[PDB]
């Protein structure tokens, strides 16, 4: 009964995902100083911090989920936008990593703009404002759930996993990450990863056509809305590679 | 060394951060005790809808 | 530091404020993960587990206050105040339904209660079972935790089988002295398992217990129907990897009624 029992788990993953969701229109309504350009700037910095510290692949997108949700409830100053991003990484690393990021090392990554007494005092303010709803559903959760249903070899599962995890990181820097739920971001990353990087001819045990129809059936978005999410991703990959 | 260490938007008025971080912390306390009539920081009062008995 | 009670609309809530050791890294890791796990259940709420209403933090050490959903009556009171002949067989079926529903809910969310007893099982005045005291005696202890071995999630289903039989005797099924003695009274009913079903790297070897034969299940819980005795043995299975799950128990013929 793996067919129903896996939808039993997936139904619960989609229902809990609908709670830890930000509003896409907080730039116009909530924030005054913060602009959509300034979010990509602080998100790129948070990504590099997790790159250098060899963080768990889940830490950076989880920290951005905290950032979008806090910006959906409270206005933050332009100067304090970086302080907010450091606090989000401080909590996300606690949730996923064995040994989290030290608050001192996070302040060093801010070029010592903030102090550890300011990060800890922001930790209480951030967690209280998020109603302690920190166990948010992540794109990595759905990715690992989708792979368990794909009958690909483990060597190909791990290369699909790496490319999909990479596509999720590029999404977190774009404003598409705000409106799209983690189910879409995860599925769009997988279908963009199973096409490879146009490096070789795609040879896979489960057909790409069957995989798109399967993912678009369970996460509930028609193939026209799934390929649109994939084309945005490959556009983010194009924009990422161009800025180099 | 590390190209990721940098300030993103210039300086920070330090005290005003400690001034604000307490301004909104007490706002969370007010939202807390206005939901359940019970001052969280002093864990004592009534007057509202609560019953409260040790 | 203590607790309180209010009750206003299912109309009873509580409040406790705990001191956490504030240090170099702010909130502890286990503190933020435990509360976040409790807050993740609020997406489904679910009737057979207690709801976490609100959590707020106030500042050495930090003070965190949790507002829980409290129930004034527990299971032991429900069974003590039961109709003097006992409980109706159909009433017990409905209680086991809510019992396993809430347990399968926790298990589906990577939560093991580890300490299930009638004191940790609350029942509202309307007859709603609500589990509490999780993610925060040795009578209902599973065999693998008495032997101090692989805990995992089937330890809760053993506790359900014990309470399952207790609803027909109204006296606990397995009541022993120590861990070594608790396993003896358990093996006196289900027999002595072989060496292949015995766990490796265990505190007490199989030679610590005399050879025993599996007594009939109806010999100790005779007020129970034939199919219920079949379901009880699947809960009281020694090997945790063959022990019945909470979801399977819902699908057994005994509970598929109404």
């Amino acid at each position: 009964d793996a067919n129903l029992l896996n939808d039993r788990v997936l139904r619960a993953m989609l229902k809990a995902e609908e709670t830890c969701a930000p509003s896409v229109s907080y730039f116009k309504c909530v924030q005054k100083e913060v602009l959509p350009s300034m979010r990509k700037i602080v998100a790129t910095w948070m990504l590099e911090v997790c790159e250098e510290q060899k963080c768990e692949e889940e830490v950076f997108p989880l920290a951005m989920n905290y950032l979008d949700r806090f910006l959906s409830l409270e206005p933050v100053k332009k100067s304090r936008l970086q302080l907010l991003g450091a606090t989000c990484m401080f909590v996300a690393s606690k949730m996923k990593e064995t040994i989290p990021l030290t608050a001192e090392k996070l302040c060093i990554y801010t070029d010592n703009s903030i102090r550890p007494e300011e990060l800890l005092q922001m930790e209480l303010l951030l967690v209280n404002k998020l109603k302690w709803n920190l166990a948010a559903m992540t794109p990595h959760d759905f990715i690992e759930h989708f792979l368990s249903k794909m009958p690909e070899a483990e060597e190909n599962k791990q290369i699909i996993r790496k490319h999909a995890q990479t596509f999720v990181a590029l999404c977190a820097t774009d404003v598409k990450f705000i409106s799209n739920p983690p189910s879409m971001v995860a599925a769009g990353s997988v279908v963009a990863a199973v096409q490879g990087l146009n490096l070789r001819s795609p040879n896979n045990f489960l057909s790409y056509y069957r995989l798109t129809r399967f993912l678009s059936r369970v996460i509930k978005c028609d193939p026209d809305c799934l390929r649109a999410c994939q084309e945005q991703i490959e556009a983010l990959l194009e924009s990422s590679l161009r800025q180099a | 060394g590390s190209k990721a260490c940098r300030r993103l938007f210039g300086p920070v008025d330090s005290e005003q951060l400690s001034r604000d971080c307490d301004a909104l912390m007490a706002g969370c306390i007010q939202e807390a005790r206005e939901r359940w009539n019970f001052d969280f920081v002093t864990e004592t009062p009534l007057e509202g809808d609560f019953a409260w008995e040790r | 530091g203590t607790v309180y009670k209010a009750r206003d609309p299912g109309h009873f809530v509580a409040l406790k404020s705990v001191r956490v050791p504030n240090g170099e890294e702010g909130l502890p890791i286990s503190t933020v993960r435990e509360v976040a796990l409790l807050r993740r259940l609020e997406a489904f709420e679910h009737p057979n587990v207690v709801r976490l209403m609100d959590v707020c933090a106030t500042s050495r050490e930090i003070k965190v206050t949790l507002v829980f959903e409290h129930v004034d009556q527990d299971l032991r009171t429900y069974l003590d105040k039961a109709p003097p002949p006992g409980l109706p067989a159909e009433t017990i079926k409905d209680l086991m339904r809510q019992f396993l529903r809430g347990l399968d809910f926790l298990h589906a969310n990577c939560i093991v209660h580890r300490d299930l007893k009638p004191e940790n099982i609350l029942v509202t005045s309307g007859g709603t079972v609500k589990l509490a005291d999780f993610g925060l005696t040795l009578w209902y202890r599973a065999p693998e935790v008495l032997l101090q071995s692989t805990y995992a999630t089937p330890v809760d289903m053993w506790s359900v089988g014990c309470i399952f039989a207790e609803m027909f005797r109204r006296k606990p099924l397995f009541c022993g002295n120590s861990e070594a003695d608790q396993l003896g009274k358990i093996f006196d009913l289900i027999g002595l398992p072989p060496e292949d079903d015995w766990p490796r790297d265990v505190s007490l070897p199989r030679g610590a217990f005399p050879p025993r034969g599996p007594r009939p299940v109806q010999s100790v819980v005779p007020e129970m129907e034939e199919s219920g005795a079949q379901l009880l043995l699947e809960m009281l299975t020694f090997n945790p990897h063959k022990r019945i799950s909470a979801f399977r128990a819902l699908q057994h013929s005994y509970l598929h009624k109404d």
Side-chain angles (χ1 to χ4, degrees), chain A, chain B residues 1-51 53-54, chain C residues 1-4 6 8-10 12-18 20-256 258:
Chain A
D1 191 23
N3 41 339
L4 181 72
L5 286 196
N6 279 55
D7 261 303
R8 265 199 80 215
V9 187
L10 191 41
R11 283 201 304 275
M13 293 172 61
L14 298 154
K15 193 156 149 204
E17 141 195 300
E18 299 170 345
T19 54
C20 315
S23 187
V24 71
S25 62
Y26 71 82
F27 288 109
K28 175 196 176 187
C29 309
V30 185
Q31 297 299 329
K32 330 293 293 186
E33 294 186 3
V34 184
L35 300 165
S37 61
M38 298 161 52
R39 179 188 170 280
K40 186 180 189 299
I41 264 61
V42 63
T44 304
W45 168 76
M46 298 167 68
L47 212 173
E48 285 182 65
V49 178
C50 301
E51 290 175 354
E52 293 186 357
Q53 288 300 315
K54 304 304 167 293
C55 275
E56 171 171 331
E57 259 58 61
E58 286 197 285
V59 179
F60 166 72
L62 176 58
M64 291 301 303
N65 181 262
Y66 301 154
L67 186 127
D68 295 319
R69 278 199 285 161
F70 188 89
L71 294 174
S72 301
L73 315 177
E74 293 232 315
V76 186
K77 286 188 170 299
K78 176 170 187 175
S79 65
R80 295 164 179 168
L81 177 60
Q82 171 164 17
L83 181 272
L84 168 64
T87 307
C88 294
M89 290 185 294
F90 191 53
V91 173
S93 65
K94 291 181 182 179
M95 293 292 295
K96 296 326 220 101
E97 289 186 310
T98 293
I99 296 183
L101 291 173
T102 41
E104 184 190 41
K105 186 150 296 180
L106 272 164
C107 292
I108 301 177
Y109 270 106
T110 70
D111 204 7
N112 296 120
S113 300
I114 64 178
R115 301 154 192 180
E117 307 89 74
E118 295 175 316
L119 190 76
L120 265 51
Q121 194 63 29
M122 186 65 180
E123 186 194 37
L124 303 183
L125 198 66
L126 162 66
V127 176
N128 280 273
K129 218 64 192 187
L130 290 186
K131 288 303 185 303
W132 287 75
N133 222 313
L134 310 177
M137 294 302 301
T138 61
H140 169 260
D141 288 323
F142 295 91
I143 292 182
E144 229 47 65
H145 196 287
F146 298 146
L147 285 155
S148 58
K149 317 246 62 178
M150 302 168 59
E152 300 292 335
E154 193 59 34
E155 314 94 48
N156 275 88
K157 284 168 111 65
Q158 223 154 57
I159 187 52
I160 289 176
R161 188 178 296 110
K162 238 300 177 180
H163 291 203
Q165 283 186 132
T166 296
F167 282 142
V168 174
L170 300 188
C171 289
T173 77
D174 195 75
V175 294
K176 180 194 55 52
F177 194 82
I178 304 179
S179 59
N180 270 102
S183 60
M184 251 185 168
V185 184
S189 306
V190 169
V191 294
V194 301
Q195 287 186 138
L197 307 159
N198 211 338
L199 292 180
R200 299 294 281 262
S201 293
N203 183 275
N204 33 41
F205 199 60
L206 179 63
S207 315
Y208 172 84
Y209 179 64
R210 297 177 170 268
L211 180 65
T212 52
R213 289 190 55 168
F214 161 61
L215 296 182
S216 50
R217 175 173 65 242
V218 290
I219 80 166
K220 292 166 178 51
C221 66
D222 50 301
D224 293 335
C225 295
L226 186 60
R227 299 200 192 102
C229 185
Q230 174 188 174
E231 290 176 1
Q232 291 192 259
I233 286 189
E234 291 143 344
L236 291 182
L237 177 56
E238 241 296 330
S239 302
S240 165
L241 294 178
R242 151 156 39 246
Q243 296 174 341
Chain B
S2 64
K3 310 195 303 180
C5 299
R6 55 200 163 184
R7 76 283 171 274
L8 271 304
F9 305 100
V12 153
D13 183 353
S14 162
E15 294 299 327
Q16 205 190 327
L17 193 152
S18 167
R19 298 171 80 80
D20 281 51
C21 276
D22 279 320
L24 309 113
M25 254 294 305
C28 293
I29 301 177
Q30 207 65 32
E31 175 68 86
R33 54 209 190 185
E34 286 200 11
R35 185 189 251 190
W36 334 109
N37 45 316
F38 191 94
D39 199 340
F40 279 61
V41 63
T42 58
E43 49 205 350
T44 37
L46 322 173
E47 328 300 339
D49 270 306
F50 227 72
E53 261 276 70
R54 316 156 296 99
Chain C
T2 76
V3 304
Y4 302 104
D8 190 301
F12 223 99
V13 303
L15 176 148
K16 85 182 68 175
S17 55
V18 188
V20 306
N22 167 249
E24 316 164 351
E25 307 306 310
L27 291 164
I29 303 168
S30 60
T31 299
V32 305
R33 296 195 193 189
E34 281 185 347
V35 182
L37 180 57
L38 294 188
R39 264 299 202 179
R40 189 167 72 95
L41 316 171
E42 203 77 354
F44 323 99
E45 300 169 84
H46 195 272
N48 299 323
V49 306
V50 294
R51 300 168 72 262
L52 180 49
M53 306 296 287
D54 191 299
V55 188
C56 193
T58 47
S59 179
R60 332 175 304 99
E61 59 189 19
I62 319 176
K63 293 179 179 179
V64 189
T65 308
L66 312 89
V67 179
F68 271 89
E69 173 193 20
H70 190 254
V71 176
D72 226 329
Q73 176 184 9
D74 73 322
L75 179 61
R76 192 79 67 183
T77 296
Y78 198 83
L79 303 174
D80 291 6
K81 75 144 211 60
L87 278 182
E90 203 62 38
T91 289
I92 294 184
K93 290 192 198 178
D94 180 63
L95 284 166
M96 292 288 298
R97 273 186 271 276
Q98 314 177 15
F99 193 13
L100 298 152
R101 287 169 187 176
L103 195 68
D104 174 79
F105 173 78
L106 299 182
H107 292 183
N109 292 326
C110 305
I111 289 184
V112 180
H113 200 162
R114 301 157 64 258
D115 201 19
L116 257 175
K117 29 185 166 67
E119 296 81 10
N120 288 129
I121 300 167
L122 311 176
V123 179
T124 73
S125 64
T128 310
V129 166
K130 297 194 182 308
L131 305 191
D133 275 322
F134 53 87
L136 223 59
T137 183
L138 309 176
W139 291 0
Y140 311 96
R141 207 121 295 173
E144 53 266 27
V145 297
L146 294 162
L147 280 177
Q148 196 49 241
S149 189
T150 61
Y151 328 95
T153 171
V155 291
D156 283 338
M157 279 308 299
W158 181 275
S159 313
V160 173
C162 295
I163 305 167
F164 192 18
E166 188 166 336
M167 303 169 109
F168 279 128
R169 342 158 59 87
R170 224 231 61 81
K171 56 186 178 184
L173 183 61
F174 303 135
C175 34
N177 291 321
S178 176
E179 316 169 41
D181 182 52
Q182 191 72 16
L183 301 154
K185 299 188 168 60
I186 288 179
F187 296 150
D188 287 13
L189 178 55
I190 72 177
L192 186 70
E195 66 164 317
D196 302 65
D197 288 354
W198 218 270
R200 320 272 67 82
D201 306 67
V202 73
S203 75
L204 267 48
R206 194 211 169 198
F209 308 85
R212 205 119 296 164
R215 298 185 52 84
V217 47
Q218 213 70 279
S219 308
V220 289
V221 200
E223 316 91 330
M224 182 174 47
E225 202 246 330
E226 177 73 4
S227 56
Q230 173 184 333
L231 176 63
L232 215 172
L233 184 141
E234 309 200 58
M235 301 187 188
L236 290 195
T237 298
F238 177 77
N239 197 318
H241 305 131
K242 193 204 171 182
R243 189 175 309 161
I244 192 180
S245 45
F247 189 73
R248 286 183 49 202
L250 261 43
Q251 313 311 313
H252 188 253
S253 315
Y254 188 81
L255 295 167
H256 272 337
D258 289 347

